[PDB]
Curated annotation (Swiss-Prot), chains B, C, D:
Main function: Forms pores that allow passive diffusion of small molecules across the outer membrane.
Membrane-spanning parts: 1-6, 8-23, 39-51, 54-66, 83-91, 94-100, 135-141, 150-159, 172-182, 184-195, 211-222, 224-235, 253-265, 268-281, 292-303, 306-315, 331-340
Family affiliation: Belongs to the Gram-negative porin family.
Phenotype of the disrupted gene, per the record: Leads to decreased susceptibility to a number of hydrophilic antibiotics including ampicillin, cefoxitin and tetracycline. Deletion of ompF confers resistance to colicin E5.
Organism per entry: Escherichia coli (strain K12)
CC per GO annotation: cell outer membrane; membrane; monoatomic ion channel complex; pore complex
Description of how the protein assembles with itself and partners: Homotrimer. Forms mixed heterotrimers with OmpC and with PhoE; other mixed heterotrimers are also probable. (Microbial infection) Trimeric complexes with colicin E3, BtuB and OmpF can be cross-linked and immunoprecipitated.
Impact noted for substituting residue 262 to L: In strain: B/r; AA sequence
UniProt topological domain (Extracellular) ranges: 24-38, 67-82, 101-134, 160-171, 196-210, 236-252, 282-291, 316-330
Protein name (database record): Outer membrane porin F
PROSITE patterns recorded: GRAM_NEG_PORIN (PS00576)
Record remark: domains: Each subunit of the trimer has a water-filled pore with a narrow, elliptically shaped (7 X 11 Angstroms) selectivity filter which has a solvent accessible area of 30-40 Angstroms(2).
Periplasmic side: 7, 52-53, 92-93, 142-149, 183, 223, 266-267, 304-305
Keyword terms of this UniProt record: Cell outer membrane, Ion transport, Membrane, Porin, Protein transport, Signal, Transmembrane, Transmembrane beta strand, Transport
């Protein structure tokens, strides 16, 4: 399997999943689904993610395929100009080839060049802190876009995106709560997808 | 009239020719609307392209060609581009458009801009948020994202226009509007503010660094009755002229009432009565002084969608004593209008 | 071109592009028509709605965009609205239209306004009743209320226009016209009078309190032949400039001759020969002096209703010593004209 | 848009609405393109009639209505007729047209005038043969008398224009162009020369009695790629202003390079990169000095044939110490465009 701190990960897994999820995570996500009208939820998803498009651009050039470097470009350019700064997915309705998907940051570029993750970790508030990805992703703080977000802005970026990401998971809870090793599924779901993003 | 509609694009060329005369005592100098020939004609186009099920692109342009000028040295007086803009409209998400267009306070003031010739004396042109002005990006949304039927709102960013004349300049600013309309009734409000260019601060009338305009509206518009009321107030934003000192500028504060009642007969006659008062305060050297104070009576006859005639009498209540020199004599306009 | 016609309304968007050059000795200053590029364009619309079986609404606007100006500080020289009016036309009662339109003395002078370029030199613009003028109410009746086929008359009231310059101002006035046309032949006369504005009376040339203009015409227009002759007299109404004292004003008296003979071949050539003389009397400081004194020979080739080329020569008979400095050199024009 | 086409005549009424804003450091004075609202609109018509099997007549008119401006005393700034000409085209013999049209040197300079907003800095207007100019007769031949598919050439005679300003004046002159195009590749060059009016010779910058302009072009335009290069030299013909003495004139000699590369993605984005440098020599008091020196990046998104958005960044290499005072700071433009 290849995991050094598995025992220190599994404690923090039990911690997040079994006390921090029932007592604070499911609470706010249910009270996010229930009290904010839908056009706001996909309204804020787009505003947040648009800031992670200039970075996805230049990291897709670095991965050597500039075709999608321009896709992330015009999504940025379009949505940020005719779409109120990002609240509107103008480029998404403009052409199917401009559909949105999970960003492409520096950790993904290190993976394209076969640098390699590091030991899998699981913090308390965070959840997964491989230094190659959730750390190299941070050179995108030295960028056109992310280089304007104050501490509380990027902290707030992380906050609401989580509430949103959790919100839409409220039925699939049964997939994971009835799982052999819910730690193993969460772990080797990370690795499969994080590898994908590095191509 | 719709002159083109192929392949999802449709272009509509429109315009009118307005035969118009103003009658007033004397020159019309000390009058409300002046005295003489005021014939004008307008041309314009509005286009709409259906990009897909979610997209629509659009643009529009409108010109004022005056017909009351000679063909000599003055043939261009009062000619102007009124509109010039383009934008998109996304599904149930709304519209975004930029160019030269209407200030957002006019989403309210339009309740009382219904007279056959005159109308909201407050929807001034090139004046921040009350009327058409150059360079406004405008977000509009109808029926609140498809949820709250009848509920509309708009946000508008107004770019700076540092022009040669204090009266037409404006600083950077922001504004917005909300409207609810249900079953014949309509209520609306709008607010805006903007910086004032240094030229505006140099005028003798008007002291302030930020200009403000807001206005509210009520209306019933059903069966054949149309009644409408507007209230709004402004700070350092309405333009004024002290005809005694030949000084121009802006009114430190203004207070505006607009009322309009009309009825529309089946055979095309539309009688109209209205009242309109805009009182100014703290005008340097004057204090308080009215700017607009009149009663309106008039009627339109609508032969059909293309031909109409009308008469519009402004019984002017301004007095000769007016400390700013606002004209006190009445004015009436007679008009015959072809439009297409 | 008729671009719209549904639901009783029909709109005709029209215009032309005229590539045109004038040739004269030297700079063209002391010539009839000058030397250089004179390219121009016209754009306009005419609308007509069927209010009912007997009533009809109409309006129309027409603009001159000069194409011989740059895109810099001069781009608008000679841009002007020519026509701008709307009105109604009821069955056998006649038509009323108000706006910027043609004076009624042009109901006569148009008989010799048929040259390929240099037509009737007396249908001045903005000059009471002879040419296009601003703000004339015009009642017209065709076939004498539906009774006397071929008999027309017209009454026109011209409102005041106290403009910037003596040349384009005018007072209130009235005029009228009668014309009978029978089996190729045509006879017409027309008259109008109006007051003179205070500025006009102050000019160094021209003394009088009322301006007067009348003209008579006879014509044949059948079997490919067109012949026409025009005579008129004016009092205090024709505009002049004494280029020696660089003084402006009006001609106390003028008596004007216009002759036109043309034939139209079936294959599209239309030759034209013409004569035109306008003499002024009682000119202050001068006395008698010719203003217009010339022969024209020229022709147009008509490919079809849209395409035309033409040449127009002015054999100018003014003498060099002309007491007003009216240009004495000849002039010729070449023209290529698309219209729709 | 083709709005009319019956009976051999076809009318294309067209235009666009451009919401356009320029962003630059500071006020925009010392920048490439300035700072502010630059919204504009275009309207025009191009008509073409089929006389018979081999002959065809055509005319065209085109206008720029600026939307950055107010409705007050400045409402006409920068409004202008751009095109106005008419002509005929006979089968395989060629075409002739006269009016205000494009000089033939632009048959080359049009290779690198393809940027979303800027570029083509050398296609000056009212400057002899490089851009739009007044009073040009232009003979064109397509596919060499019907023989050499892809072989084009043109001859043009340029009339005098003695205008108010040295900058817009020009004397008589002649020029021509030749072009070959085969399966995506294109190479062309063109030359013209002309006299200088006495007003032009009197300006402090530029002295000579003859003006000359020539240019060559290379291009690839196939699949989704477009590459272009432009080289030209001028003598006494490019206009300059040394803002240090606020002196105007013409550049005795210039050397112009323009390079343009773009690609058109499946999803509609058309990115653009370009280089553009114009160097002047023998400029009185200066010696050599750059007038245009920049790198460009930008892109347009094409929603469909009618709707487009764009961004244009000019990385400006002019230096702050530039001896003619040409702006040295960068400039970027945003635009939204409906067209029909
Ligand atoms: C049920 C409790 C088991 C979860 C482990 C909690 C230990 O503290 C974790 C860090 O705080
Ligand atoms: C779903 C997108 C809705 C767009 C609304 C934009 C609201 C932004 O306004 C903030 C400006 O207020 C000051
Ligand atoms: C519900 C809207 C009521 C509007 C009041 C109309 C006032 C009309 O009076 C006009 C004459 O003054």
């Amino acid at each position: 399997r290849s995991d050094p701190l598995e025992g220190f990960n599994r404690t923090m897994f039990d911690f997040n999943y079994n006390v921090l999820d029932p007592y604070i995570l499911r609470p706010v996500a249910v009270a996010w689904r229930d009290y904010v009208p839908m056009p706001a939820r996909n309204g804020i998803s787009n505003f947040t993610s648009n800031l992670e498009e200039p970075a996805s651009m230049v990291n897709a050039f670095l991965k050597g395929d500039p075709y999608r470097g321009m896709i992330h470009f015009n999504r940025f350019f379009l949505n940020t100009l005719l779409g109120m700064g990002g609240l509107i997915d103008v480029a998404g309705m403009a052409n199917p080839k401009l559909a949105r998907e999970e960003p492409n940051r520096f950790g993904s570029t290190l993976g394209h060049y076969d640098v390699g993750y590091g030991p899998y970790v699981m913090l308390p508030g965070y959840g997964s802190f491989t230094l190659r990805d959730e750390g190299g992703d941070f050179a995108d703080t030295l960028y056109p876009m992310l280089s304007y977000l104050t501490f509380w802005m990027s902290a707030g970026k992380w906050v609401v995106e989580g509430i949103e990401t959790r919100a839409q998971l409220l039925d699939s809870d049964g997939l994971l709560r009835n799982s052999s090793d819910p730690y193993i599924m969460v772990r080797e779901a990370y690795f499969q997808r994080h590898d994908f993003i590095a191509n | 009239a719709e002159i083109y509609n192929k392949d999802g694009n449709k272009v509509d060329l429109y315009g009118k020719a307005v035969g118009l005369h103003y009658f007033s005592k004397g020159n019309g100098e000390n009058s409300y609307g002046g005295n003489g020939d005021m014939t004008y004609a307008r041309l314009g186009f509005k286009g709409e392209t259906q990009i897909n099920s979610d997209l629509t692109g659009y643009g529009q342009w409108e010109y004022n060609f005056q017909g009351n000028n000679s063909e000599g040295a003055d043939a261009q007086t009062g000619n102007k581009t009124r509109l010039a803009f383009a934008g998109l409209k996304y599904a149930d998400v709304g519209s975004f458009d930029y160019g030269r267009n209407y200030g957002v306070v006019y989403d309210a003031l339009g309740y009382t801009d219904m007279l056959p010739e005159f109308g909201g004396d407050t929807a001034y042109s090139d004046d921040f948020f009350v009327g058409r002005v150059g360079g406004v990006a405008t977000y509009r949304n109808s029926n609140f994202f498809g949820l709250v039927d009848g509920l509309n709102f708009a946000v508008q960013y107004l770019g700076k226009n540092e022009r040669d004349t204090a009266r037409r300049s404006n600083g950077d600013g922001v504004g917005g509007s909300i409207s609810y309309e249900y079953e014949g009734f309509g209520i609306v409000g709008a607010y805006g503010a903007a910086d004032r260019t240094n030229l505006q601060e140099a005028q003798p009338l008007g002291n302030g660094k930020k200009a403000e305009q807001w206005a509210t509206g009520l209306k019933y518009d059903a069966n054949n009755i149309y009644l409408a009321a507007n209230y709004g107030e402004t700070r350092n934003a309405t333009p004024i002229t002290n005809k005694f000192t030949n000084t121009s500028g802006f009114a430190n504060k203004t207070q505006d009432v607009l009322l309009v009642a009309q009825y529309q007969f089946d055979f095309g006659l539309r009688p109209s009565i209205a009242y309109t008062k805009s009182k100014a305060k703290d005008v340097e050297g004057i204090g308080d002084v009215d700017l607009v104070n009149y009663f309106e009576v008039g009627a339109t006859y609508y032969f059909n969608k293309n031909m109409s005639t009308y008469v519009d009498y402004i019984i002017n209540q301004i007095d000769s004593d007016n400390k700013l020199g606002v004209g006190s004599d009445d004015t009436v306009a007679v008009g015959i209008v072809y439009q297409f």
